[PDB]
Structure 1
């Protein structure tokens, strides 16, 4: 019902009970306070309009799926689509003040994997990890998401630019389902929308840019979640098996605040690049049909000789971060 917050949690690992069980960093700040995990979402007059971009350092996102400060973004992926590596890139190459990771229903190997990654991260001293392994009860798994969101909220009221990560909404939805089964004007199932409406940018405080991951089958929860959130990023298993990392299918992904966080020339270049991707796909299905010969259609040859530079722009090593100017420069070179 109440949990620890404060800068003293930076570099620490928190279990569903609110206590620190491990540390991936040490900080000279020992600020420890207590706040309720079940806080009311902000009033409509207390929120601000999403107008600033949340740069991620990832080219395809910053160029075609530009996130906003205070946005709630869905990350839809399958078994091996590089979702964990995508989250690692989001933490590593973005510019948030504080990161709060929430592993819901994960396995011990995955928790220790995230800890081992944070122990060698550059954002190491600015992260708080709240985990709940698959051993904990459903109540503990939901309380883990509530705890992470509460910590992120405290850091927001202090004016910090916070990035919250929830992995995943699927396993959290299962735990919430079991709790609802434990009960049979207040419904346990309502804890999912109320949880999703807590991030955002406050007029009197900082912001919480949230990334909720949703697992896909090799789903009604996924569709309603995509209806609640401010946009989604689709990680295609097809692209992942072709060697495309990040396996982001930008033609099946959207940011609902895109036109509000980028200017006009960015909009034009992004539209041109999306049309180029569409034409590239049409040429791909034409080639698969075996009806493409070099020399006949000059348009198909122009689009054909563009596949290399486009695929080169979409791909990005997980160790490299690109500034906004570099991203717009590269995408500008790609659509010539």
Structure 2
């Protein structure tokens, strides 16, 4: 029973997306892929993945396509191994699905090798220490929660706070000039968002159809059944692992949304005979996510810079899925709806974000000191805001109002217009250098810009843009005064 290639079985049960298969010669190994060879008048092929063994002959499986027109006793043939996906530089510039089949209608892809989507994670001895700052061109991220090359980044947020926009900005700022390759994995998200990304990447020449591309796309979206949404992440991760190990390149891995991987497995968990856990997720929530996350790491051979978007259902960060993902990250960016409602974008709550490289040994001393001072001032400003509502701004001391006035400028100065959100904002984006951000905030903390109007810091880039906006504000105010004077 070593080589199960071509082994035959029959469908015994079909309930939703879960199908039971009976093999007379013994069920193949778990995670094995099966093809429904029977002609059932379907418009699409049917493939199944074994997830459990009910007995020595019966095996429970999840389908990757809709189980419509599936009859009992239908013949099934093993593929002799797990689900395999193409790898190599020939996949660049292409769009794939969970099964590794191109869906861009751009002709056959020349694949020299295929790899299984299920692989063992790197061990402890295969861990590399890479502490280097990653400049994303965003004031908030670069200052409070700087990102680390070869590390893991999470964008925790509700619905409509700007998770997808930030990812687009990161791609535009980090991927266009990236030395290595990039892999984008769409998981249980809107199909139109994938289309917009494909168009933008082609326009930015990341995907050069006539020339050489430098990115791969793997899409399993909402329309797809839960079986596909539970494996598309593994497929893309497998492509990135190959680029890391075989090609020895530094690769970027964007995932949106990683929560859907958990959601899909919870949907199928009920039909697999597993008692639900708290809230209603599967009992294997922590282990399944851990196996996937540990594979997303930088080893001694290469480095993977991972950016993952996490959906916090109903803005409840106490939910099992968002919380379970916090320990598997090197930099967490927590977005808050209240911030966005106030016109501040990106709607980052700096008091809830964290970074591993926020240590003087890794980053410059000035950077560390400035960030801590900003956080302390914001914390204090929030305590005062309670006083300002009960007593009023008049009652605050001289020192307190200076904190209030400086802190409000910090809050508005953290906002930044992105180059990808021009339609939303109607203004050109800015790319702020790391040094400019540190110097601008350092001067603000010590009061070098106490006389600048507060609104001059709203939706601007570096300090230079602040001065220009203040000058423009002064000019228009003078014009209004002149108009009033004539009246």
TM-score under structure 1 length normalisation: 0.88
> In structure 2, do the counterparts of structure 1 residues 14 and 333 end up closer, same or farther at CA, with 3 Å as the change threshold?
farther
Q: Distance in 2 between matches of 1:325 and 1:122?
A: 29
Matches within 5 A, 1:26-105: 33-94=113-174, 96=178, 97-105=180-188
Is 2:275 the partner of 1:275?
Answer: no
| Of 198, 217, 220, the match for 1:115 | 198
The match for 2:397 is 297
Q: How does 1:229-240 map to 2 (within 5 A)?
A: 229-240=329-340
User: Could you tell me which residue of structure 2 aligns to residue 176 of structure 1?
Assistant: 265
Alignment check: 8 A CA contact 1:141 1:172 kept: yes
Match of 1:216 among 301, 312, 316: 312
Further displaced range: 317-326 or 235-244: 317-326
- Give the count of matched residue pairs: 328
Question: Residues of 2 paired with 1:313 and 1:226: CA distance?
Answer: 27
RMSD: 2.5
Q: Which runs of 5+ in 1 are unaligned?
A: none
The whole-number CA distance in structure 1 between the counterparts of 2:339 and 2:206 is 29
Q: Which has the larger radius of gyration?
A: 2
2:266 aligned counterpart, secondary structure: helix
Task: Name the SS for the 1:76 alignment partner.
Answer: strand
Q: Select between 283-292 and 53-62 the one with higher mean Cα deviation.
A: 283-292
Distance 1:299 1:23 in 2: 65
Cα drift, residue 309 of structure 1 = 3.3
SS in 1 for 2:188: strand
1:91·1:99 contact (CA, 8 Å) conserved in 2?
no
Q: Does the CA contact (< 8 Å) of 1:81 and 1:236 recur in 2?
A: yes
Select 1:106's aligned residue among 157, 174, 189: 189
Superposition deviation, residue 86 in structure 1? 0.7
The structure richer in helix per residue is 1
The answer to which of 62-71 and 236-245 deviates more is 62-71
SS of 1:311's equivalent? helix
Does 2:111 correspond to 1:21?
Answer: no
Deviation at 1:312, TM superposition (A): 4.0
TM-score by length of 2: 0.62
1:180–1:188 contact (8 Å) kept in structure 2: no
The counterpart of 2:250, out of the listed 149, 157, 161, is 161
Question: Given that residues 86 and 111 in structure 2 are in contact (C-alpha distance below 8 angstroms), is that contact kept between their aligned partners in structure 1?
Answer: no
Deviations 1:217-243 (A, max 9, x none): 331111122133334211100001111
Q: CA deviation at 1:177?
A: 2.1
Q: Which runs of 5+ in 2 are unaligned?
A: 1-82, 208-212, 274-282, 420-429, 447-487
Structure 1 position 131, deviation (Å): 0.9
Q: Point out the more displaced range, 312-321 or 174-183.
A: 174-183
Would the aligned equivalents of 1:68 and 1:257 in 2 still touch at CA under 8 Å?
Answer: yes
Residues 287 and 210 of structure 1: is their aligned pair in 2 closer, same or farther, counting only changes over 3 Å?
same
Range that drifts further, 50-59 or 230-239: 50-59
Call closer, same or farther: CA 1:265–1:175 in 2, change over 3 Å: same
